Design a protein around this ligand. Structure first.
Ligand SMILES: *[C@@H]1O[C@H](CO)[C@@H](O)[C@H](O)[C@H]1NC(C)=O
Ligand SMILES: *[C@@H]1O[C@H](CO)[C@@H](O)[C@H](O)[C@H]1NC(C)=O
Ligand SMILES: *[C@@H]1O[C@H](CO)[C@@H](O)[C@H](O)[C@H]1NC(C)=O
Ligand SMILES: *[C@@H]1O[C@H](CO)[C@@H](O)[C@H](O)[C@H]1NC(C)=O
Ligand SMILES: *[C@@H]1O[C@H](CO)[C@@H](O)[C@H](O)[C@H]1NC(C)=O
Ligand SMILES: *[C@@H]1O[C@H](CO)[C@@H](O)[C@H](O)[C@H]1NC(C)=O
Ligand SMILES: *[C@@H]1O[C@H](CO)[C@@H](O)[C@H](O)[C@H]1NC(C)=O
Ligand SMILES: *[C@@H]1O[C@H](CO)[C@@H](O)[C@H](O)[C@H]1NC(C)=O
Ligand SMILES: *[C@@H]1O[C@H](CO)[C@@H](O)[C@H](O)[C@H]1NC(C)=O
Lengths: 242, 344, 239
């Protein structure tokens, strides 16, 4: 109920339809479990990271098979075939080449570490906001209006379950900005004046909860000429009859 | 100084509608390098000693392809947030607001807006073998760098589809408010949407309805003012021009590095091969090969750094588009100075 | 290279000229006092579009800066992949080996400039087709100036977001990787031991950063709460 009040829907609608909400939540959880069980190509990022690291190590190993202008790529052969003072040239060439390879590998590792650090910071702030609280930012914790968040641990990463609110099928209604009862403009406190065929009601923004127009739902202000689209109707007074 | 007492308060009596511009880079030019062409330059005597460094060549090509696919991912993520494409309404009747400048004009190619036309004209951004062969008098740098295995790949999504996505987003946010961000779009009169925004920034909705004409006039005047300022002040799109100039300078200096001999007797393979026997020429060939490989590696590393910075900026732009455009943000200064109302 | 006529005229004491790349582009013929220009014979990029070799062996070739008419000027199997009957000029060079299709679907292999190539059953024969990109489903909003739409029902939805947290920590022994059980070597590495120390310091910094990231992401709260025994959550099943 607190979450529903947070996303701008009155808390009573949750208590009116609790069983449906529980059934929908359970069905959605089962559906995503089945999707994870079936669709294998879902955890692309973690596999990409581990494959990238393995490929970097494998190519670093493979670099040893190239002679950087020397006569051979193995120190034992050079040392067996040549005297020290002249073989030192080939040894120096190989040393320079392998140092360059190591430096390149280290630099690429630094780049990847910086990118992973950025991703980790994003994950940390997402955990702080969406999981430990309710976020009013749009699309930060999933499409729709955010309600809850359940974290799960995955190797070299994290997966979030963003439980969200999505409005279903709608209807077409005729609306007016204000209502002129008796020479006085009236404006809705929280909702919008919606009119069906031959009646006027007031409803909340994100749900259809028709209500009769009373002095407790509207506040008076101004006159009946300034507003562009004012219409005539009647306002119920819940004190005069008594 | 502020006249501060312990029982005194100041309260505003009027409001002014203001609009600002925020420019962020999203993507950089994609490039690919043919290492063997850049090093050996079509010599069969060369490209036989590059079998040892083919691994380095493959590493560079892999890194550059990764950068290119990252650029495509960035430009897709920034603008393709919403999927359903909404057609602009025919009748405007928006209560006074005139969105003519930003709404697309179908009387021109690519159906791009007036502001988009001016922005495209502000930033000063295909070839053929016959064109490069014939045009010798004008020493254009594009042909010279293309003759050395340096090619520029086009983006996957061109400007027409970007304009289409922008028009769809604008039409959705105008005819449906922010409800089209989550779920299906719901039509709302623009006055009701503006009242919703005013209620969001803590100002009672009635003050909007009591002062609609003044607000519409202020909005139109502000739009015209920024249009004139952008048409006059040329030094406004500094970042995008800086990005393209940086990429062009990097390519130009990579081309220029070919004129230095890394300790060899000469900086051209043809001269060394014509002046020396193979066994003593291989030393100079190896020296030049090592130098040019170092140059290519340096260029790749700098490109990686620039790509990382651009990715950070693109992520910022994507979240800004998600928050300020598809909704109303209560964070201060995130969507401009003042209290945020709209975003186009 | 390829020789051609040149408009430039050398000074009497000059023989050949050099460009910015310091290579010989223009020369003066010794037999006939004439100026000729030299240009490389290779110019242009080629890319190979293909589905998995597990699927099929057919390929499509994209020439980046060559019109399909001038393909013979640019360049058995290669000639077949150069001949016509399937040419398709695009905004990023002409494409040979694929069939144009009017319909638009989601992208599979990005050719570039709004063109995508994919494997489809163009009848159960298979062929590589090229089509324009599909942005999305067209739609319009029935917008009036006194009409509003209001939802009447709600749907609870759950989504998954996956983010990397850390990468594998590594360390490198420079002397072992370079020389290897060699007393003759590892004596000339005393000069580059400083570089070795620099690499080791960088790698240790990366590793401690990874540990810090792993700690920071998941250890936000300190007090550890035991799960309750009785669920009685009003209907929600958190099994
Ligand atoms: C409008 O709502 C009132 C409320 O009772 C109802 O009596 C009336 O039939 C409705 N009009 C139409 C056209 O359904
Ligand atoms: C717009 O609304 C006004 C009243 O607010 C109405 O008089 C007018 O007819 C409406 N526009 C159209 C095209 O009907
Ligand atoms: C509303 O009532 C006032 C006074 O009774 C009248 O002048 C006005 O014309 C009415 N408006 C409409 C739309 O009938
Ligand atoms: C508020 O500002 C507008 C435009 O500057 C002006 O027309 C209006 O009179 C001002 N309000 C008051 C109460 O002076
Ligand atoms: C050089 O010899 C060629 C072939 O014998 C001849 O065509 C040419 O005219 C000669 N050049 C001069 C300057 O006589
Ligand atoms: C193609 O890939 C599938 C899935 O990886 C595999 O089962 C199949 O055996 C492969 N084809 C061949 C000819 O091996
Ligand atoms: C070459 O291709 C371009 C592509 O825009 C086209 O405009 C031009 O007419 C073509 N020229 C020839 C000779 O095919
Ligand atoms: C699509 O365009 C091509 C080229 O004009 C044409 O041959 C084909 O018939 C078109 N397809 C349809 C369904 O109109
Ligand atoms: C709302 O949706 C649920 C499930 O789709 C359905 O059982 C319920 O009847 C719907 N509400 C109305 C008022 O039809």
């Amino acid at each position: 109920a607190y979450r529903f009040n947070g996303i701008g829907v009155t808390q009573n609608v949750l208590y009116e339809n609790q069983k449906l909400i529980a059934n929908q939540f359970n069905s959605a959880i089962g559906k995503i479990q089945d999707s994870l069980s079936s669709t294998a190509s879902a955890l692309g990022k973690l596999q990409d990271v581990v494959n990238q690291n393995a490929q970097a190590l494998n190519t670093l190993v493979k670099q040893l098979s190239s002679n950087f202008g020397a006569i051979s790529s193995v120190l034992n052969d050079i040392l067996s075939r040549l005297d020290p003072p002249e073989a030192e040239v080939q040894i120096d060439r190989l040393i320079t080449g392998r140092l360059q390879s190591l430096q390149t590998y280290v630099t690429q590792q630094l780049i990847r570490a910086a990118e992973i650090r950025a991703s980790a910071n994003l994950a940390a702030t997402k955990m702080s906001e969406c999981v430990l609280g309710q976020s009013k930012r749009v699309d930060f914790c999933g499409k729709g209006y955010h309600l809850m968040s359940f974290p799960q641990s995955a190797p070299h990463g994290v997966v979030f379950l963003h439980v969200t609110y999505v409005p279903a099928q709608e209807k077409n209604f005729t609306t007016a900005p204000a209502i002129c009862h008796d020479g006085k403009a009236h404006f809705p406190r929280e909702g919008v004046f919606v009119s069906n065929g031959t009646h006027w009601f007031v409803t909340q923004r994100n749900f259809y909860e028709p209500q009769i127009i009373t002095t407790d739902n509207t506040f008076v202000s101004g006159n009946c000429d300034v507003v562009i689209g004012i219409v005539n109707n009647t306002v119920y007074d819940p004190l005069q009859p008594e | 100084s502020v006249a501060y007492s312990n029982n005194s308060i100041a309260i505003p009596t009027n409001f002014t509608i203001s609009v600002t511009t925020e420019i962020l880079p999203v993507s950089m030019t994609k490039t690919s390098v043919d290492c063997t062409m850049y090093i050996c330059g079509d010599s069969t005597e060369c490209s036989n000693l590059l079998l040892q460094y083919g691994s380095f060549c493959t590493q560079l090509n892999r890194a550059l392809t990764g950068i290119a696919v990252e650029q495509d991912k960035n430009t897709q993520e920034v603008f393709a947030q919403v999927k359903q494409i909404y057609k602009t309404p025919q009748i405007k009747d928006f209560g006074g607001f005139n969105f003519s400048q930003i709404l697309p004009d179908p009387s021109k190619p690519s159906k791009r807006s007036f502001i988009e036309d001016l922005l495209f004209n502000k930033v000063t951004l295909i070839k053929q073998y016959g064109d490069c062969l014939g045009d010798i008098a004008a020493r254009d740098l594009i042909c010279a760098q293309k003759f050395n295995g340096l090619t520029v790949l086009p983006p996957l999504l061109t400007d027409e589809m970007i304009a289409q996505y922008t028009s769809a987003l604008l039409a959705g946010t105008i005819t449906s408010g922010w409800t089209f961000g989550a779920g299906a779009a719901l039509q709302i009169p623009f006055a009701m949407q503006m009242a919703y925004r005013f209620n969001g920034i803590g100002v009672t909705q009635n003050v909007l309805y009591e002062n609609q004409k003044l607000i519409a006039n202020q909005f139109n005047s502000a739009i015209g003012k920024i249009q004139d300022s952008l048409s006059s002040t040329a030094s406004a799109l500094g970042k995008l021009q800086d990005v393209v100039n940086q990429n062009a300078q990097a390519l130009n200096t990579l081309v220029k590095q070919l004129s230095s001999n890394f300790g060899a007797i000469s900086s051209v393979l043809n001269d060394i091969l014509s002046r020396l026997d193979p066994p003593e020429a291989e030393v100079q060939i190896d020296r030049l090969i090592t130098g040019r490989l170092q140059s290519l590696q340096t260029y790749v590393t700098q490109q990686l750094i620039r790509a990382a910075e651009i990715r950070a900026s693109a992520n910022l732009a994507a979240t800004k588009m998600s928050e300020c455009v598809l909704g109303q943000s209560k964070r201060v200064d995130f969507c401009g100075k003042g209290y945020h109302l709209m975003s186009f | 290279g390829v020789l051609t006529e040149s408009n430039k005229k050398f000074l009497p004491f000059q023989q050949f000229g050099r460009d910015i790349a310091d290579t010989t582009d223009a020369v003066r013929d010794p037999q006939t006092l004439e100026i000729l220009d030299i240009t490389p014979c290779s110019f242009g990029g080629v890319s190979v579009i293909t589905p998995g070799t597990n699927a099929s062996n057919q390929v499509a070739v994209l020439y980046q800066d060559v019109n399909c008419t001038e393909v013979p000027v640019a360049i058995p199997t290669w000639r077949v992949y150069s001949t016509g009957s399937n040419v398709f000029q695009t905004r990023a060079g002409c494409l040979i080996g694929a069939e144009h299709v009017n319909n638009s679907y989601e992208c599979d292999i990005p050719i570039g400039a709004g063109i995508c190539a994919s494997y489809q059953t163009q009848t159960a024969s298979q062929s590589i087709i090229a089509y324009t990109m599909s942005l999305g489903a067209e739609n319009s909003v029935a917008y009036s100036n006194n009409s509003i739409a209001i939802p009447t029902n709600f749907t609870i939805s759950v989504t998954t977001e996956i983010l990397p947290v850390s990468m594998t920590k590594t360390s490198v022994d420079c002397t072992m990787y370079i020389c290897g059980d060699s007393t003759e070597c590892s004596n000339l590495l005393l000069q580059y031991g400083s570089f070795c120390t620099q690499l080791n310091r960088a790698l240790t910094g990366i590793a401690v950063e990874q540990d810090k990231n792993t700690q920071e992401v998941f250890a936000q709260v300190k007090q550890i709460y035991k799960t309750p025994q009785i669920k009685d959550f009003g209907g929600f099943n958190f099994s």
